[PDB]
């Protein structure tokens, strides 16, 4: 189990523009296209992203290309963030996967808002951080995925995904 297989389970794969759980225009493996209500703004963003006329539809390969960028971008974002980088540095390999997951889903800004939880992860107080992260809009909105991520932080294993 790796970060890619993990995100592919949580995000799924869709070759046609679709709306995410929040209502936003998305495609591929969780690649948010626009927060705009316009299916037209989305179709436009999409062609700018792929470099061709897609007419809201892309190939598997294109979806994987977007996915590799997004994971890379998330990883570099964590390493560039003064709030995130120390947490990351401090964790084992599996737990690190859990934080990339949150970042990919919610943006560096959002994860950075979990101050208390991040502090507990840093202190390796696993159970407490799990209890605290559950008190969030994140968890109430997408509970099954949140639970999976939270278990990964609590235990340090890939259990929730197997
Ligand atoms: Cl709450
Ligand atoms: Cl969910």
From Swiss-Prot:
Domain of life, source organism: Viruses
Catalyzed reaction equations: Hydrolysis of (1->4)-beta-linkages between N-acetylmuramic acid and N-acetyl-D-glucosamine residues in a peptidoglycan and between N-acetyl-D-glucosamine residues in chitodextrins
The protein's Enzyme Commission number: 3.2.1.17
SUPFAM superfamilies documented for this protein: Lysozyme-like
Stated induction or repression of this protein's expression: Expressed late in the viral replication.
Effect in UniProt of substituting residue 117 to F: 10-fold decrease in enzymatic activity
Enzyme class: hydrolase
GO terms for cellular component: host cell cytoplasm
Keywords linked to the UniProt accession: Antimicrobial, Bacteriolytic enzyme, Cytolysis, Glycosidase, Host cell lysis by virus, Host cytoplasm, Hydrolase, Viral release from host cell
Gene Ontology molecular function: any one: lysozyme activity
Subcellular locations according to the entry: Host cytoplasm
Impact when changing residue 11 to Q: Complete loss of activity
Active-site residues, as the UniProt record annotates them: 11 (proton donor/acceptor), 20 (proton donor/acceptor)
Result of changing residue 20 to E/Q: Loss of 99% of enzymatic activity
Binding-site residues, substrate: 32, 104, 117, 132
Main location (coarse class): host cell
Pfam families according to UniProt: Phage_lysozyme (PF00959)
GO terms of biological process kind: cell wall macromolecule catabolic process; defense response to bacterium; peptidoglycan catabolic process; viral release from host cell by cytolysis
pH dependence: Optimum pH is 7.3.
Effect annotated for changing residue 11 to N: Loss of 84% of enzymatic activity
Family assignment from sequence similarity: Belongs to the glycosyl hydrolase 24 family.
Function: Endolysin with lysozyme activity that degrades host peptidoglycans and participates with the holin and spanin proteins in the sequential events which lead to the programmed host cell lysis releasing the mature viral particles. Once the holin has permeabilized the host cell membrane, the endolysin can reach the periplasm and break down the peptidoglycan layer.
Protein name: Endolysin
